[PDB]
Amino acid sequence: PQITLWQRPLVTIKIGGQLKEALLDTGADDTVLEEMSLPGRWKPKMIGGIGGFIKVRQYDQILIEICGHKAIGTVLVGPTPVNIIGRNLLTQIGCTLNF
Amino acid sequence: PQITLWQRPLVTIKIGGQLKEALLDTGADDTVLEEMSLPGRWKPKMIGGIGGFIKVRQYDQILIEICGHKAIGTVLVGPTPVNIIGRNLLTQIGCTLNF
Ligand SMILES: CC[C@H](C)[C@H](NC(=O)[C@H](OCc1ccccc1)[C@H](O)[C@@H](O)[C@@H](OCc1ccccc1)C(=O)N[C@H](C(=O)NC)[C@@H](C)CC)C(=O)NC
């Protein structure tokens, strides 16, 4: 589809059998979701944005469905105020910026 | 043009007669640039991101050229890690997300 930017580009995602709302973020290198449980082993990681850094847990090879499109990649979980779909996953669904 | 996201969507912008590099960020409501000198009076604003909030100076009706497209709008200046072109200006140049 074609998403305009008059409003925040929020979409529905499916992860771990759960439905959630997330922001398509071209400014994010990584994908980070609010605190939740995921299977497998995780590694600690510090990610920084506007405001500073936060500590998150890194899970690899996680399957996520974005607007019906399946994608696989690293998903970080932590105290983020909003679920963010970053470039590592946006590329897998063929997302591009156009103007 | 069409910009893929395998790399950060960095573009060249022109403001105050100077060239700078900035990130096309669909996850940002506002446009924030690194510390610099702009004309006129400014108003205060607090903006929040991943690691918390930062204080910035708000300037209105600022001329900024993005990839050759001229836009005139609100620009924030503060301790941001990178120059960010947010939705307020992305809509002015007709930018959309597609997949
Ligand atoms: C998952 C974050 C990721 C690890 C990080 N990227 C960023 O922080 C991006 O910023 C560019 C950036 C790029 C590189 C280093 C630092 C900063 C991002 O798109 C922000 O812009 C945007 O974050 C999503 C968000 C939306 C609403 C509320 C809170 C957060 C955000 O903070 N939006 C604010 C917002 O819209 N708040 C409502 C806005 C005012 C900031 C200009 C990164 O890639 N680090 C290397």
From Swiss-Prot, chains A, B:
The record places the active site at 25 (for protease activity)
Q: Where is this region: Dimerization of protease?
A: 1-5, 49-55, 88-99
From what superkingdom does this record's organism come? Viruses
**Taking every annotated instance into account, which residue ranges of this chain make up the domain Peptidase A2?**
20-89
Quaternary structure and partners: Homodimer, whose active site consists of two apposed aspartic acid residues.
What does it do?
A: Aspartyl protease that mediates proteolytic cleavages of Gag and Gag-Pol polyproteins during or shortly after the release of the virion from the plasma membrane. Cleavages take place as an ordered, step-wise cascade to yield mature proteins. This process is called maturation. Displays maximal activity during the budding process just prior to particle release from the cell. Also cleaves Nef and Vif, probably concomitantly with viral structural proteins on maturation of virus particles. Hydrolyzes host EIF4GI and PABP1 in order to shut off the capped cellular mRNA translation.
What is the name listed in the Swiss-Prot or TrEMBL entry for this protein?
Answer: Protease
Protein source organism: Human immunodeficiency virus type 1 group M subtype B (isolate BH10)
Q: What is the lineage of its organism?
A: Viruses, Riboviria, Pararnavirae, Artverviricota, Revtraviricetes
**What gene does this protein come from?**
gag-pol
- Residue span relative to the full protein: 501 to 599 of 1447
